[PDB]
Design a protein around this nucleic acid. Structure first.
Ligand SMILES: [Mg+2]
Ligand SMILES: [Mg+2]
Ligand SMILES: [Mg+2]
Length: 105
RNA sequence: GAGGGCGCUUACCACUUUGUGAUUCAUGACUGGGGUGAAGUCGUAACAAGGUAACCGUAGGGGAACCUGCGGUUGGAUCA
């Protein structure tokens, strides 16, 4: 509770109970998520509020309220897990492989 | 003179010093796991004969669930 400014920022990573949200200038600021969010992926622009600092300058987390629309999505299903998106909102993928241990086709 | 006091010395002994032990708390780089986590990734182990029957004990293997070897049990299906 006692949230801050609703703004647009880029989510750095996903950690289940919380997420890392980069602001509009390059500030690593970890936040938790809203209960009604169906999914949150790496690199998804969101609407979020950075809580409120309890100590002056020292805050713990904020919240991520809403999720914008998807440009792309990477949905891959799995046995006994269902269809799960991995990453989203991307224009180019680079398939990276190595000759070790194997190079399959 | 007898005797006493003072003073000195000795025995006992508190505090105090060194050497070196046992025990206890606080601090403590680092490090060993374990628990609590609905949505995170990795796999599909077990529960049906759960798709190589499972499990216990022991040795080895490898991100991991686990696997194989030896022996035991039915807390196993199908049974003749
Ligand atoms: Mg299995
Ligand atoms: Mg089995
Ligand atoms: Mg056996």
């Amino acid at each position: 509770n006692l949230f801050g400014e609703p703004d647009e920022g880029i989510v750095i990573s996903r950690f289940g109970m919380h997420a890392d949200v980069e602001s509009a200038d390059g500030d690593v600021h970890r936040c938790n998520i809203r209960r009604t969010i169906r999914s949150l992926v790496t690199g998804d622009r969101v609407v979020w509020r950075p809580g409120k600092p309890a100590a002056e300058g020292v805050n713990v987390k904020g919240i991520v309220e809403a999720v914008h629309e998807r440009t792309s999505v990477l949905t891959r299903p799995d046995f006994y897990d269902g269809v799960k998106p991995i990453a989203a909102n991307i224009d180019q993928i680079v398939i990276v492989s190595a000759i070790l241990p194997e190079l399959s086709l």
